[PDB]
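Q: EfeO-type cupredoxin-like domain-containing protein, please. Structure only.
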Amino acid sequence: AEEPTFRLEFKDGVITPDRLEVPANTRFRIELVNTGSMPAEFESLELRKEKVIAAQSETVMVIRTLDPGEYPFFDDFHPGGTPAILIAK
Ligand SMILES: [Mn+2]
Ligand SMILES: [Mn+2]
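A: Structure for EfeO-type cupredoxin-like domain-containing protein:
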């Protein structure tokens, strides 16, 4: 594996970890693991990125590149859940 790979757990709107530092200007992967009972949707407004993860399932999201900066994200299917963030640096 020559690509950095991170992991986020989604569980009924709670995202862990809620803060993820990632490299900027770099292609990388995030394993999105939904351990809850409802489908989840990774969504970031700024990045225009949305990815569904069915309950009790996993999918691996590819981020092609991020300019340095901070990118809030959340489970769009569970409003009021964790406001998480990617910190690209
Ligand atoms: Mn959505
Ligand atoms: Mn929404």
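A: Brief note, in case it's useful. Residues 44 and 73 are 4 Å apart (CA to CA).
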